[PDB]
Amino acid sequence: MKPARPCLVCSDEASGCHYGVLTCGSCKVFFKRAVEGQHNYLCAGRNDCIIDKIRRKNCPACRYRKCLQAGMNLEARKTKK
Amino acid sequence: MKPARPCLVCSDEASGCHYGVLTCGSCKVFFKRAVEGQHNYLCAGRNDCIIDKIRRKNCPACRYRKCLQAGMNLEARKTKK
DNA sequence: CCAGAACATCGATGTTCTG
DNA sequence: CCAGAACATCGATGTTCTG
Ligand SMILES: [Zn+2]
Ligand SMILES: [Zn+2]
Ligand SMILES: [Zn+2]
Ligand SMILES: [Zn+2]
């Protein structure tokens, strides 16, 4: 099969560095679209949801927060090292 | 009293006794679809998310439970007028 | 190699309509 | 008045190309 190198904010099979963190494709555009305005979402739980290839589309509030945490930031490759 | 505006499972405008319970189109529909379809409903938290006009898309696993909880039955007494 | 656009594709959901 | 059915929407997530 494939081995594995899991994305820093779900756990899917990562694609490359995205806006600064090893994330998959989805985390890639999810974060971009979230950041580019209006990320007002409410959590249905107590601000700590679990994540993964499925549960990830359950709560954008938490996913966006997990992006932020991983380090994902808009002008990543501008500075890299 | 008892008719009463608020959806018993997501407090939006209810439309009438749907499947047992005063409820809305969405939930109405959601219940049937829930009970006779294939799905991967899993909750990201610890199965007690708030269902609400918005969040109710977050945890269908939780909604469906709220459904079951509130009485909604498929093969049930069709009434309310 | 990563950014960001086009498409195209589904499953989930929602509303209006019609028996 | 309600079940169900027929639309019609939303939103994720491919894939595939640029620069
Ligand atoms: Zn991811
Ligand atoms: Zn959450
Ligand atoms: Zn409802
Ligand atoms: Zn839940």
CA-based nearest residue to B53, from A61, A42, A63, A56: A42
Return the residue matching tokens 């999810």: A30
- CB under 7 Å from any atom of strand C: which residues? A 15-20, 28, 32, 74, 76-77; B 24-26, 28-30, 33-34, 37-40, 56-57, 60, 63
- The pair of three-digit structure tokens given for residue B48, joined into one six-digit string: 């007690």
Which DSSP category does A63 fall into? H
State, as a whole number of angstroms, the distance between the CA of B49 and the C1' of D6. 32
Q: What is the DSSP string of A22-49?
A: EE-HHHHHHHHHHHTS------SSSS--
Q: Give the CATH H-level superfamily of domain A1-81.
A: Erythroid Transcription Factor GATA-1, subunit A (3.30.50.10)
- In order of A14, B17, B24, the CA distances from B8 in angstroms are 41, 10, 9
The answer to whether the Cβ–Cβ distance between A44 and B45 falls below 8 Å is yes
Sequence-ordered list of residues with C-beta below 8 angstroms from that of B37, at least 6 positions apart, any chain:
none
CB contact under 8 A, A45 and B44: yes
Q: How far is CA A24 from CA A3, A34, A63, B17, B37, in A?
A: 15, 16, 13, 45, 30
Task: Please list the residues that pair with A68 across neighbouring strands.
Answer: none
Q: If you search the block for the tokens 């007494």, which residue do you land on?
A: B77
- The 8 Å CB, 24+ separation contacts for B10-18 are B10/B51, B10/B52, B10/B53, B10/B56, B10/B63, B10/B66, B11/B52, B11/B53, B12/B53, B16/B80, B17/B79, B17/B80, B18/B72
Tokens 């008719």: give the residue: B3
The residues that bridge with A18 in the sheet, in sequence order, are A21
Bridge partners (DSSP) of residue B13 are: B6
Q: Answer yes or no: do B40 and A50 touch at CB < 8 A.
A: no
Q: Look at residues A25, A34, A38, A24 and name the one whose alpha carbon lies nearest to residue A63.
A: A34
Query: Resolution reached, in Å?
Result: 2.9
CB atoms within 10 A of CB B54: 13
Which secondary-structure segment (H or E) carries B56? Answer: none
Q: Which of A19, A6, A1, A2 is nearest to A56 (CA)?
A: A6
Q: Which residue is nearest to nucleotide D14 (CA to C1')?
A: A25
Secondary structure (3-state) at A13: strand
Closest by Cβ to A58, choosing from B48, B50, B59: B59
With contact defined as beta carbons under 8 Å apart, do A43 and A62 qualify? yes
Cβ burial, residue B57 (10 Å; 0-12/13-18/19+)? middle
- What is the rounded distance in angstroms from the CA atom of residue B65 to the CA atom of residue B68? 5
Q: Helix, strand, or coil here: A57?
A: helix
As ranges, strand D nucleotides with an atom below 7 A of a protein CB are 1-6, 11-15
- How was it solved? X-ray
